[PDB]
UniProtKB/Swiss-Prot annotation, chain B:
Localization per Swiss-Prot or TrEMBL: Host endoplasmic reticulum membrane
Cytoplasmic side: 1-38
Origin species: Zika virus (ZIKV)
Subunit structure: Forms a heterodimer with serine protease NS3. May form homooligomers. Interacts with human SPCS1. Interacts with non-structural protein 2A.
Domain notes: The central disordered region transitions to ordered by binding to NS3.
Function: Required cofactor for the serine protease function of NS3.
Region (Disordered) location: 8-30
Interacts with and activates NS3 protease: annotated span: 4-38
Protein name: Serine protease subunit NS2B
Membrane topology term: Multi-pass membrane protein
Amino acid sequence: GETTDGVYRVMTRRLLGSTQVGVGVMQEGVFHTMWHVTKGAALRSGEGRLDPYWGDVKQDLVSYCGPWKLDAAWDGLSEVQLLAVPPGERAKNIQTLPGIFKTKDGDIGAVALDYPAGTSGSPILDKCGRVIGLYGNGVVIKNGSYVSAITQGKR
Amino acid sequence: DMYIERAGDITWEKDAEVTGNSPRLDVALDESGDFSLV
């Protein structure tokens, strides 16, 4: 029933009450979130239904109503902003300089920000307002804090 | 039954709180999408 652009909370109608499981990005008529948020289950946008279109467990990404539309990436130098939408709190931009996930296949940006597990899927933005990845898949480091990869898909 | 609700615009804020460090970590990604330190 809605295809406007912006950031969205992903909610559930569970046993008794509602609960925010994650966050998503609606852009160009496609809803982008992380797989561990929806597990490939269809979503409701008012009176209209959003059916999964593409998904990958290893990438931990899922797109609804169309292919993955987000293609921007971190430049490896400038600061980014985590558009965190925590449960019960208004959307807030958290600026930070990403670290690096040095992997077998290359470097990936990573933000050392620790937020509730209902922020999963929150977009990470560059200086031009482009989504360079989603927040929610990462590691817990040697001390106990959380570091999220900047998880981006392919277009 | 899951559903979405709009939370705001996708915009860079000209006055955002800056926090968090920039750790460089050697990790590995397995077939199940899990990161692990090396």
